[PDB]
Amino acid sequence: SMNPPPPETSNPNKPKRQTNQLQYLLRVVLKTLWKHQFAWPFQQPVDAVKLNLPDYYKIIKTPMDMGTIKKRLENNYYWNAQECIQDFNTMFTNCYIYNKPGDDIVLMAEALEKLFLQKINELPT
Numbered sequence: 001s002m003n004p005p006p007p008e009t010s011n012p013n014k015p016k017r018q019t020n021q022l023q024y025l026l027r028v029v030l031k032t033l034w035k036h037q038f039a040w041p042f043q044q045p046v047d048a049v050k051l052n053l054p055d056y057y058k059i060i061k062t063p064m065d066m067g068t069i070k071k072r073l074e075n076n077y078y079w080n081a082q083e084c085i086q087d088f089n090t091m092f093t094n095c096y097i098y099n100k101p102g103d104d105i106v107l108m109a110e111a112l113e114k115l116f117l118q119k120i121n122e123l124p125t
């Protein structure tokens, strides 16, 4: 189809390891963004067929979304917090580079990113 397989969310051979930063990323950062009124366009992978988004996957090489991030955190997929932070950054970058400035989707992304950056500024050491 026009859509790729969704990003992997589990690593069956990675040992389980918790960090307080990963706990914060799930229980504070992801939870806060997930419950925000503007979360809905970002809660699942972009479906370029259903959304009629021409060339989305020609332009966006590394799709990412908060449903994938949520599952990765729940499944202890990330070895470290910085991998998770990178996924959030990629999600926002994809939106800003594909869509036109001032499209509603971009303004929603910016509100979520502002909240994200606020919480990251309090990331535990």
Ligand SMILES: Cc1cc(NNc2ccc(C(=O)Nc3ccccc3N)cc2)c(N)cc1O
Pocket (backbone or CB within 6 Å): 040, 041, 042, 046, 051, 053, 094, 095, 098, 099, 105
């Ligand atoms: C990251 C990113 C996302 C998107 N849109 N994502 C969407 C758009 C719409 C919906 C929706 O459910 N609408 C909806 C709202 C109310 C009643 C029923 C329905 N169906 C879900 C996701 C675009 N375009 C560009 C983009 O870069």
